[PDB]
Design a binder for this molecule. Sequence first.
Ligand SMILES: Cc1cc2nc3c(=O)[nH]c(=O)nc-3n(C[C@H](O)[C@H](O)[C@H](O)COP(=O)(O)O)c2cc1C
Ligand SMILES: Cc1cc2nc3c(=O)[nH]c(=O)nc-3n(C[C@H](O)[C@H](O)[C@H](O)COP(=O)(O)O)c2cc1C
Lengths: 350, 350
Amino acid sequence: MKRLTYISKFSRPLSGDEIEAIGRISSQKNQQANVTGVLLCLDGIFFQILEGEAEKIDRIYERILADERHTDILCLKSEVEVQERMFPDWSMQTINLDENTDFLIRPIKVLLQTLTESHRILEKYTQPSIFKIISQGTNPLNIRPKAVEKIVFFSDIVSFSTFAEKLPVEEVVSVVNSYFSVCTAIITRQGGEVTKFIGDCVMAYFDGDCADQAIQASLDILMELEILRNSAPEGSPLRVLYSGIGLAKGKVIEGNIGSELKRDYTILGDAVNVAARLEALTRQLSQALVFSSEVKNSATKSWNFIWLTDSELKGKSESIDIYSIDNEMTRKSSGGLEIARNIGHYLERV
Amino acid sequence: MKRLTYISKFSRPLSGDEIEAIGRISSQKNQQANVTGVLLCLDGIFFQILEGEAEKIDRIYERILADERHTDILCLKSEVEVQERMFPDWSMQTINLDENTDFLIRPIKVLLQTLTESHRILEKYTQPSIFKIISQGTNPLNIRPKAVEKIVFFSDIVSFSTFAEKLPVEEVVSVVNSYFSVCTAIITRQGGEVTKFIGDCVMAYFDGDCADQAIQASLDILMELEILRNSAPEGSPLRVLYSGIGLAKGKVIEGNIGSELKRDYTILGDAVNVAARLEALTRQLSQALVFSSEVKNSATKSWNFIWLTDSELKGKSESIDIYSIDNEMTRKSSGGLEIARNIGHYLERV
Ligand SMILES: Cc1cc2nc3c(=O)[nH]c(=O)nc-3n(C[C@H](O)[C@H](O)[C@H](O)COP(=O)(O)O)c2cc1C
Ligand SMILES: Cc1cc2nc3c(=O)[nH]c(=O)nc-3n(C[C@H](O)[C@H](O)[C@H](O)COP(=O)(O)O)c2cc1C
């Protein structure tokens, strides 16, 4: 069996009437599916626990997920090896704690609410990989480190120091956050994971066999930034926001890395260094996207690869052959590196 | 008034008897101080809410903090402008939910527990700065970005690539985590903040007027690693664990930086780049600790500064004068960079 626990926020106000109706109808379909559980509500927050066959639960939650009456849906716990149910008598019991006024339920009310709003704060500071792991039914703290092949992605803002010199601090942060939101959205939809931000740089990774997705994500980021630049208001700093991107492939260690009190679930490896160093060369090479021979050969799609150079760095005392893709978008983005060499004037008249 | 909410874990088993005794005696002192609230317990977890004068509350919580019967104490919320109390009739009401068996309290029990263990997971993945901010009575998500002077700290493991090449993945992660735990402990006690790990590198910062603390932290890290090396088992990879450290000083932006769904509270600025580039030069300069002219002059203590070189990088088209400190510990640590050039043999026979 599978028991699932999630929380969510009302998309819009709901009345006790509407709440019960959701419950009453939940209880119905749940009876029909031998799934049981409890649904609570407290000041515009839903808490629900469901249990039943993995097959069934997954489909219910697929509908619950697509329901527009709540949002910010977060699975706190997925137990995918349950052999006994916790709420056998309740197909779907509803407990509206707002309406409740009981002696002991009152202090617990103020507790749940404080606990929930604190959890919601921590969520905003938490790697996306962690919640994914949790929803796969795994406690991320118990994952042991492993060697794995990854494609590593590194990208940063071209001439970022000029932004930081010229703009008000609120503007600088707005620009970086816009950049990060664009990269993160595209990378995530393409099956990758954004694992760290450092300065104005994004570090991300894809499964080792997913070079075509790494490359497509990268091209989509360039395309999206192009839309963002040419759609931005007159005088906006966004009109001169350009990216450089570097991709590398290698065996890295994945796992919980950090101090006692603070860890990240992330990767450690030479491919990370190589990706970052490739990305640094975007300027010298006048190419907005640059990647290693290994990424190129590992890709299966018929991209228009162009060989750029043979270069060195580090370490293994070896020269690495460096590629890009030749198309209208990469040419426009690569011309963008030139444009971004002199944006100080533009930026200081905002 | 000030209302405080925290959670904590039993250090060791406590009985309902012991729990009530804590309550009964809490209620007493709380009556004597016009402070009110509620204390709940549920499967080895304490939840407490206290309210009263900031003066009083802070001292109670100072004792609660120093009490060995619970641990992992975490303030979820501090409201430092309260004008009305939530539990006027209760100097300290105790609600043992373990003992409770009420109809509605049961599903709420399983909820609190799930919510709490999920929060505890997120805590391990959360920057230390966030909890500090929360305990200062501030929602970190509402902090606006600001320009501030900081001393930036950057450090990494010397010849880390050799560790990763030669050791089992569990060993590699153990070594990095030991390193990170040493740096984090010392930096935090010296008033600094560890804000990011990237690869085997630590990035941290101190208030702009705290150069002497940045420098002392750095020297303490070197000393601690020396203890760690010479105390390590025979054949241990820890025996050849050495660090390089770079410090820079500058105006940076502090604030919430990231994508929509994932941000860090951290800093953005040229001083970050300079610190990282100084640290990279530790190898070339054969000095384990290197810092900028600005850090040197900003320090007030009578350190034994040694001038090292005049070097360049980036950007502002300027040469920066680079310093270290000459004493037995930095000499031993700097010889350590040489030792660490050839640890492949040692490491592969573990
Ligand atoms: C808080 C909340 C809890 C819900 N719980 C359930 C549930 O337990 N089971 C269920 O089938 N639908 C539940 N739903 C609603 C589903 O998203 C969806 O409306 C319904 O299951 C689909 O019905 P259909 O057969 O018309 O597609 C819930 C909705 C909300 C807002
Ligand atoms: C869960 C828990 C809750 C506590 N709550 C209070 C409290 O509300 N007020 C208080 O004075 N001490 C509280 N204490 C205990 C204090 O840490 C400490 O034992 C006591 O306040 C100091 O008493 P003293 O005057 O002998 O130093 C609590 C301890 C625990 C474990």
